[PDB]
RNA sequence: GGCCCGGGGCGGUUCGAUUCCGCCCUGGGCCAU
């Protein structure tokens, strides 16, 4: 029931069991055979090759080494060729460049093409660096794999384990580097409590210093930041999580938090107790990869939020959600309605020129002098958040992300009230408002 | 696709805009895959 003890039972949650490993070995086996009966120059990398793969997330990554001189196209053509001839099933996939995805003896496999190079510089694609990361990482991680797993388990369980844009957390490489630095999960957690947004971790120099931003410098590339895509808040959440784990160790930290739905009737009551405005902007999901959708949703949500605050509606928090069919931009505002008149600051009284122009615009309610300068009452074109957003989205759709914006321009609607709790956005909303229970 | 930095034109808004809201082309850097 204490630190160690818990970490004991925890392994049971993060370490792949015999049959899962056996499935993987036999798959690795076959794969190696097929690549040889064709005699290609390949190298297995990633967590499978270093036995740092988290339980239930088996996936083999085979990198195909190609001569420097080979043209970009040759790598991909031949890359696809090899993948097809060795994979039971094959489905081309994309990233920096196209690669191949499939299955062998029932396990996931990624066949990527890269340049067999020497020494970190000369790296052409990002994937060209992976081979190095593997070299640098294999000798050093040995005998600590289970540590890399506890860490991956911890993060994954609190939704901060991926480094892709839909998570902005810790990548698997970052995780090992951490273990290779602190020595184990417990040490990583223990020290993480003292981490700050100005913390720099230089693996290669075994040093920790103060920088301008959280920076884990790549053993292979001193300029590169491995935690480049880790959000300031996710950084913060982890530091807070580690502080709690040490405070009250628990096996719960390794268990995926239960979905915990809420009846739409309880949610309506809560919004009533909060007396706020709760609405969402719905639109068709652009058929694009997640790495493109979310950075866009984030922006879209940001722009409308910012429109909301300068517009005086006192937004409290924003939030977004994507489904197979639509995307929802959720908001909560302190102001359900606002007067139609508002005051506009004008020039200082002794500026005859500007004052004259200021008083030249005919308005309905006659400007006045207050504390040295002129003011005018003006009228709003809208008086509720929803009204304003309907106005904003219609005219600034183009500012919400290339794709998200093209979708909103063609179709969008604002939901709220009962009709909104029907939508598949209750968790995000509960998450947004800190609903607890 | 998104973020950062920087140029050249514009639009709207405003008494007043390089300085708010945005659109054109445009240069470098970074991120996820």
Curated annotation (Swiss-Prot):
Catalytic activity: a tRNA precursor + 2 CTP + ATP = a tRNA with a 3' CCA end + 3 diphosphate; a tRNA with a 3' CCA end + 2 CTP + ATP = a tRNA with a 3' CCACCA end + 3 diphosphate
Miscellaneous field: A single active site specifically recognizes both ATP and CTP and is responsible for their addition. In contrast to the eubacterial homologs, the specificity of the nucleotide-binding pocket is determined by both the enzyme and the tRNA.
Biological processes annotated in GO: RNA repair; tRNA 3'-terminal CCA addition; tRNA surveillance
InterPro entries xrefs: CAA_C (IPR048833), CCA-adding_arc (IPR008229), CCA_tRNA_nucleotrans_2 (IPR042090), NT_2-5OAS_ClassI-CCAase (IPR006116), NT_sf (IPR043519), NuclTrfase_I-like_C (IPR011068), Polymerase_NTP_transf_dom (IPR002934), tRNA_NucTransf2 (IPR015329)
SUPFAM superfamilies assigned to the protein according to its UniProt record, in alphabetical order: Nucleotidyltransferase, PAP/Archaeal CCA-adding enzyme, C-terminal domain, PAP/OAS1 substrate-binding domain
Subunit structure: Homodimer.
Recorded consequence of changing residue 50 to A: High decrease in both AMP and CMP incorporation
Keywords associated with the record: ATP-binding, Magnesium, Metal-binding, Nucleotide-binding, Nucleotidyltransferase, RNA repair, RNA-binding, Transferase, tRNA processing
Chain residues that bind Mg(2+): 59, 61, 110
UniProt binding sites for CTP: 47, 50, 133, 152, 161
EC numbers for this chain: 2.7.7.72
Protein name, per record: CCA-adding enzyme
Tree of life domain: Archaea
GO terms for MF: ATP binding; CCA tRNA nucleotidyltransferase activity; CCACCA tRNA nucleotidyltransferase activity; magnesium ion binding; tRNA binding
Listed cofactors: Mg(2+)
Cysteine disulfide partners in this protein: none
Keyword RNA-binding in annotation: yes
UniProt xrefs under CDD domains: NT_2-5OAS_ClassI-CCAase
Similarity-based family: Belongs to the tRNA nucleotidyltransferase/poly(A) polymerase family. Archaeal CCA-adding enzyme subfamily.
Function per UniProt: Catalyzes the addition and repair of the essential 3'-terminal CCA sequence in tRNAs without using a nucleic acid template. Adds these three nucleotides in the order of C, C, and A to the tRNA nucleotide-73, using CTP and ATP as substrates and producing inorganic pyrophosphate. tRNA 3'-terminal CCA addition is required both for tRNA processing and repair. Also involved in tRNA surveillance by mediating tandem CCA addition to generate a CCACCA at the 3' terminus of unstable tRNAs. While stable tRNAs receive only 3'-terminal CCA, unstable tRNAs are marked with CCACCA and rapidly degraded.
Residues reported to bind ATP: 47, 50, 133, 152, 161
Cleavable signal peptide: none
């Amino acid at each position: 029931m204490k630190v160690e003890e818990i970490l004991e039972k925890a392994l049971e949650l993060v370490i792949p069991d015999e049959e899962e490993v056996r499935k993987g070995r036999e798959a690795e086996e076959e794969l190696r055979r097929r690549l040889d009966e064709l005699g290609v120059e390949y190298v297995f990398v990633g967590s499978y090759a270093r036995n740092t793969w988290l339980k239930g997330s088996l996936e083999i990554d085979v990198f195909l080494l190609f001569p420097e001189e080979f043209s970009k196209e040759e790598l991909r053509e031949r890359g696809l060729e090899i993948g097809k001839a060795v994979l039971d099933s094959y489905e081309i996939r994309y990233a920096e460049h196209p690669y191949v995805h499939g299955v062998v003896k029932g396990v996931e496999v990624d066949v990527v093409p890269c340049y067999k190079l020497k020494e970190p510089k000369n790296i052409k694609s990002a994937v060209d660096r992976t081979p190095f990361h593997h070299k640098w990482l294999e000798g050093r991680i040995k005998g600590k794999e289970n540590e890399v797993r506890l860490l991956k388990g911890f993060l994954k369980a609190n939704g901060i384990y991926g480094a892709e844009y839909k998570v902005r957390g810790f990548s698997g490489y970052l995780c090992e580097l951490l273990i290779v630095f602190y020595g184990s999960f417990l040490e990583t957690v223990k020290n993480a409590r003292r981490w700050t947004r100005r913390t720099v971790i230089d693996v290669a120099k075994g040093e920790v210093r103060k920088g301008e931003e959280f920076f884990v410098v790549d053993p292979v590339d001193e300029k590169r930041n491995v935690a480049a895509n880790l959000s300031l808040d996710n950084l913060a959440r982890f530091v807070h999580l580690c502080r709690e784990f040490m405070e009250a160790p628990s096996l719960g930290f390794f268990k995926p938090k239960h979905p915990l739905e809420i009846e739409p009737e309880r949610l309506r009551k809560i919004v009533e107790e909060r007396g706020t405005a709760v609405f969402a902007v719905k639109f068709r999901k652009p058929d694009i990869v997640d790495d493109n959708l979310y950075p866009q949703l984030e922006r879209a949500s940001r722009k409308i939020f910012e429109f909301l605050e300068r517009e005086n509606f006192m937004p409290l928090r924003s939030a977004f959600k994507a489904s197979e069919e639509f995307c929802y931009l959720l908001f909560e505002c302190q102001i359900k309605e606002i007067s139609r008149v508002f005051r506009r600051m004008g020039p200082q009284f002794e500026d005859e020129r500007n004052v004259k122009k200021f008083l030249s615009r005919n308005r309905a309610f006659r400007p006045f002098i207050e504390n040295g300068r002129w003011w005018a009452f003006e009228m709003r074109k809208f008086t509720t958040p929803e009204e304003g957003v309907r106005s904003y989205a219609s005219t600034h759709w183009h500012t919400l992300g290339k794709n998200v914006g093209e979708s909103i321009r063609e179709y969008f609607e604002i939901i709220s009230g009962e009709k909104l709790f029907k939508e598949p956005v209750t968790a995000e909303l509960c998450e947004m408002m800190g609903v607890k229970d």
